[PDB]
Amino acid sequence: MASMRVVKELEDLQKKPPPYLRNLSSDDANVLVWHALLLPDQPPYHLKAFNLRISFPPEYPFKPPMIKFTTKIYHPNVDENGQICLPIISSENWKPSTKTSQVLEALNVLVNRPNIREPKRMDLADLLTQNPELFRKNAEEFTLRFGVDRPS
Amino acid sequence: LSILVRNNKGRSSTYEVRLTQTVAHLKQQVSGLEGVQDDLFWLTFEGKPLEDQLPLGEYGLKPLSTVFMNLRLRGG
Amino acid sequence: CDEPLSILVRNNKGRSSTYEVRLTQTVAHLKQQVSGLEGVQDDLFWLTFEGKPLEDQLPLGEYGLKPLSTVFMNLRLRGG
Amino acid sequence: SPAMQRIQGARVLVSGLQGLGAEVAKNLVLMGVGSLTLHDPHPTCWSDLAAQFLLSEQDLERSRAEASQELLAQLNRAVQVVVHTGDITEDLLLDFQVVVLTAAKLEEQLKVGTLCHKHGVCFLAADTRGLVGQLFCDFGEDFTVQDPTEAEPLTAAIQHISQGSPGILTLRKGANTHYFRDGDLVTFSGIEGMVELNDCDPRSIHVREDGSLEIGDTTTFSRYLRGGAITEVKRPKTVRHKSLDTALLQPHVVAQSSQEVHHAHCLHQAFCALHKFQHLHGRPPQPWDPVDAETVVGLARDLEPLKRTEEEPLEEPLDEALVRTVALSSAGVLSPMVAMLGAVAAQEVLKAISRKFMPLDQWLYFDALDCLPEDGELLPSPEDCALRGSRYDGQIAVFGAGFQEKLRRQHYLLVGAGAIGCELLKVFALVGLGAGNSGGLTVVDMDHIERSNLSRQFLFRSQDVGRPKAEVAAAAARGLNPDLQVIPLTYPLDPTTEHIYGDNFFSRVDGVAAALDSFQARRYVAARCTHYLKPLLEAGTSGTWGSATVFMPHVTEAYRAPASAAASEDAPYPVCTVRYFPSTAEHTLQWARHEFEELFRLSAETINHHQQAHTSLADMDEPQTLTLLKPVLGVLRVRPQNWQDCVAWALGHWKLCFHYGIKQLLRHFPPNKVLEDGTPFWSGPKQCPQPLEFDTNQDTHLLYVLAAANLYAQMHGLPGSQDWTALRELLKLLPQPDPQQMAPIFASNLELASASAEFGPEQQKELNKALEVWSVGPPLKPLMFEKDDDSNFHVDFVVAAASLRCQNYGIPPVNRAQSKRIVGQIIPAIATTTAAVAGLLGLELYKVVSGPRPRSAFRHSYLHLAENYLIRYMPFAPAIQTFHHLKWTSWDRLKVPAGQPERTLESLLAHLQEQHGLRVRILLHGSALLYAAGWSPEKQAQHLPLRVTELVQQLTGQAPAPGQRVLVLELSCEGDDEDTAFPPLHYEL
Ligand SMILES: *OP(=O)(O)OC[C@H]1O[C@@H](n2cnc3c(N)ncnc32)[C@H](O)[C@@H]1O
């Protein structure tokens, strides 16, 4: 069963939480969903925090976990609903060996360095390539209007 | 008379849906009390397909029955 | 047994490819090699020899493999 | 396709239409042999009703051929089944292509075999004597096969063939690099450019190191423009077969080992002894008669030693015990063995008819004597096996009446009623499994019969389409055996239906037989059987492959599903890796299916319902859908009533979806001018997109156009018919309609760079009012996509779209096998392999019913008919796992009583730690955590005093219903790893 491995991974991760992740916890009713706060360390995203939900499919680890950004984040790789296209999560590259810590690290890297090659929103990539400054303005406005209270 | 309803969104229990009226009229109330459109996921009552315009009450829903639904379509 | 031997593994599509294995290598090693070569998950198939299947944990030297011995690869079947 | 043209024109002859001949004829009729000819003038007796499914009790004292002809003809209406009531003569054998002599005397076998080998007619002589089979095939002196292996020709992608004179060619790295060999012919199907190399003679290749592939002389040809698909050509192989009267002395048997060859030689000696005995005394040996067995073994002892290999010294004598056992149980014919051997014989007949696959090399002997009682048990007695006029006389002549009672007391379960399910139902009905007042049967299936199912089905007629599959299968099974009581159930055996199939349901069942079509279903059913400790019989076929396994509790290893394949069954393939980077044609067809689903289905429920319910284009991804739906056809300021049979409504979509977009992305993101990381390194990975010229000579692009037009006419009710020979002139009369609508297709209405939502409220209001106007009309019912209707070319639309897109992206086109690999007319099953696996499962059912048997009695089977491959091996022992003092297998479980008052969580943990000597670090029921050693002391002090049932009720929010015998919850321990898996804890209530 996937739940045993998920609980083991969460228990191991709580001991030494990643620096960009805090208050990572799961409800005892359903231990296959994780709630965590993402703390990017690169402007303009460093003004606030981001809350995301990690959902493990019943046949984990043979199927990749599902990651969705619960909060509203302005990003070329993140759709409005919040789904993200990580290279590791994609079934063409997913392997059962990779635990969730590598997935979270890749997510943080993607947030810091966007995958401009294949965005889920083409217009955002076009704006970023043609005029990075306007993208900076709009991203700062969005992360100020929707950014969750960032802790220390 | 109650119907046990569980949803993958989170904690769920018996909703306002009653067997007296078709679920087509109950779509408005379930969407209002869930915040997520029914178009996202298709209900699977005990391994049986469901449709908006198909009254399910004539297919033998025993008292205190159960309803299931799963994530559908592509994410993107 | 210092000299490794070359054996043949039969694909499900009637094709045989020459491998290079040691009798000390367990069947897990050969299974991983053929999985990587054929692009099939090592848990989706099992490989047999002389009509009897090969266990993952035993060394190939238990099954008495000779040089140029054809080891059949059997998939796990889904349709029914 | 060419093979199926020969089958419909073939003629075969089946002699001795007993149980075996009936099975062969049924398989031939299902496969579609054009004209059979049944020949059996002997009257029906009681001893042949235990294996033949076409003869009833009322057909006694009547010719078997005539009695079976009615049911065989009604089985399939495209087969001209006739009965030959005369005698076999040379002019008769001249007409037929294949003759089969099932259970015919040795004199008749030799006579017909000599006559057929004299006239170049393929000959088969199958025969079943109890629990041992025999097959012989002789396909003439010079028989040439054309498709030696059950495999598609190899395909690869070429990229660079610049080097010339040795014909050096390079191709992409992968398995295809080493797949090709030296002594093989390779033919280039055809690519754009290099007309010299297209449709040329096959050219032998040479494989060189570092990927070099030598083609030969190609410098004098044209210049290499672009790479394409390369296919292989199979080399026909000629096989020579000895005549029967010559092959008797030197049996070239098919086997996988020297021991199996010796076993087959001993079986051959036993069969020859039986034939000689019948020649001498004129009667088959009596059932389990010691004197007849001694006579047969004495005949085998004095049988000519030249019957074996003359040149090889007789190192060991024949097994006296094996020959005696064969003689003892040689007076009956059994349904499972008949099914298996008839499947193999019909496959050989199809090989001879269609000239495909490698024909069986003469003899093949199948041994299934393990189904007899163990050596220490009580073997059947001659008085027990006495015939008493029941339909199971042939089975009693091998097992005895007590075994028949044991069979009929059983109450079994059959999950799934597909092809293997129907064949298993036939085997159960003929064998007599639960055909009494104490037993019964249960068929669990959800699906309904459709046209594409009953093509090669046995129990389903033409008028049963749309009825429940379980109900029709139950009616057919009750028809086969009147005493059988079958209870059809429609609710699937799925985790959502564990209340129906609970402890009260699984208490009655004595075993489970699974004929499922997915790995997830098999895994769930095996989990349920392991939980309830029920015998499980599982079979699975793919093409000519087949497996048949039995998983007895605490005897054989539990089912281990290929979790990778089970996960891949439901594959949410990301669109992020298919929009711009199609690796293979599979990606192209996946993208085509996705766009078809997006355009033809999701639009119906969002055009009116979504707008009328809530939201708008601002807070939803509506504008893209509206932009792709509104101007593609044309507004015309009036209600759309134009017929789809026009160039504009199809060629415009073709150019917009396959030329305009790719040109726009090329001019926006040039492959060599991508601004990535400042200096690009590998921009444009392995693919440079480029639209092709509008070549009207290619009819492939017109197929997609006509498919789209017909699909729109069908979905919107627009008029349209088969105007293939009438509307072509009109279609070609407008070659350039694109410039007439330059402005609407250029960029929205007025845009240069689109700024940041330059359309504004003025265009948004226009879009909203256009949506409101279009929302008035006939309702569009959300009808589900039907892939069964091949006449309207649904799958053809997707295939054409995939082919054109892959040609656009320089990807090899989709082949027939690639098309059938997906839900677009998925590969159907073959009757022969289905019957074979069902027969092996029936052979296993004999041992399961027989009661307590060791692991060595049971056998797992795996067969490949296209290359005469078959193995029966005893299964592995349970995998014992160890952890300190506790040692367990995959069947073991922990049972802890809750007591008259329910113990608290701390009491349960203390009981576990004392009784089993393990410390619980994590204890969770399902996916709800109940206790963790890493919890803060306050949380542990909060959770421990509560009762386990109360804790579960508090967490999951649902109290257990009455009848919850056990709560099953898993646990972990301190100091272990993630590799170990402790047995589930059955918390008894
Ligand atoms: O001929 P076939 O290989 O398609 O047979 C498979 C049959 O199995 C039914 N099925 C599939 N899965 C289930 C479950 N979980 N429960 C009950 N029946 C099931 C299909 O109807 C199919 O015909």
Numbering used by the authors:
A (entry chain C): 2 to 153
B (entry chain D): 82 to 157
C (entry chain B): 78 to 157
D (entry chain A): 24 to 1012
Copy text from the publication:
ISG15 is a ubiquitin-like protein that is activated by an E1 enzyme (Uba7) and transferred to a cognate E2 enzyme (UBE2L6) to form a UBE2L6-ISG15 intermediate that functions with E3 ligases that catalyze conjugation of ISG15 to target proteins. E1 occupies the apex of the Ub/Ubl conjugation cascade where it performs two main functions: (1) specific activation of Ub/Ubl in a two-step process that results in the formation of a thioester bond between Ub/Ubl and an E1 catalytic cysteine (adenylation and thioester bond formation) and (2) recruitment of cognate E2 enzymes followed by transfer of Ub/Ubl to an E2 catalytic cysteine (thioester transfer). While Uba1 (E1) is specific to Ub activation, ISG15 is exclusively activated by Uba7 (E1) and specifically transferred to the E2 enzyme UBE2L6. Here, we present cryo-EM structures of human Uba7 in complex with UBE2L6, ISG15 adenylate, and ISG15 thioester intermediate in a conformational state that is poised for catalysis of Uba7-UBE2L6-ISG15 thioester transfer.
To gain insights into the molecular basis by which human Uba7 activates and transfers ISG15 to UBE2L6, we sought to determine the structure of a ‘doubly-loaded’ Uba7-UBE2L6-ISG15(t)/ISG15(a) mimetic complex. Previous studies in the Ub system have shown that although the single-loaded E1-E2-Ub(t) complex is capable of catalyzing thioester transfer, that double-loaded E1 is significantly more efficient at E2 recruitment and catalysis. To generate a mimetic of double-loaded Uba7-UBE2L6-ISG15(t)/ISG15(a) complex, free ISG15 and ATP/Mg2+ were mixed with purified singly-loaded Uba7-UBE2L6-ISG15(t) which allowed binding of ISG15 to the adenylation active site and adenylation of its C-terminal glycine, thus incorporating the ISG15 adenylate (ISG15(a)) into the complex. The double-loaded Uba7-UBE2L6-ISG15(t)/ISG15(a) complex was prepared and imaged by single-particle cryo-electron microscopy (cryo-EM). Two reconstructions of the Uba7-UBE2L6-ISG15(t)/ISG15(a) complex were subsequently isolated, which we refer to as Form 1 and Form 2, with overall nominal resolutions of 3.38 and 3.21 Å, respectively (masked at 0.143 FSC). Both reconstructions exhibit the same overall architecture and do not appear to be functionally different, with the main difference between them being the strength of ordering of the SCCH domain, ISG15(a) NTD, and ISG15(t) CTD. Globally, the Uba7-UBE2L6-ISG15(t)/ISG15(a) complex exhibits a conserved architecture in both forms of the complex with the AAD, IAD, and FCCH of Uba7 engaging ISG15(a) and UBE2L6 sandwiched between the UFD and SCCH of Uba7. Cryo-EM density linking Gly157 of the CTD of ISG15(t) to UBE2L6 L121K and linking UBE2L6 Cys86 and Uba7 Cys599 are clearly visible and only slight structural rearrangements would place the relevant atoms in position for catalysis, validating our strategy for trapping the complex.
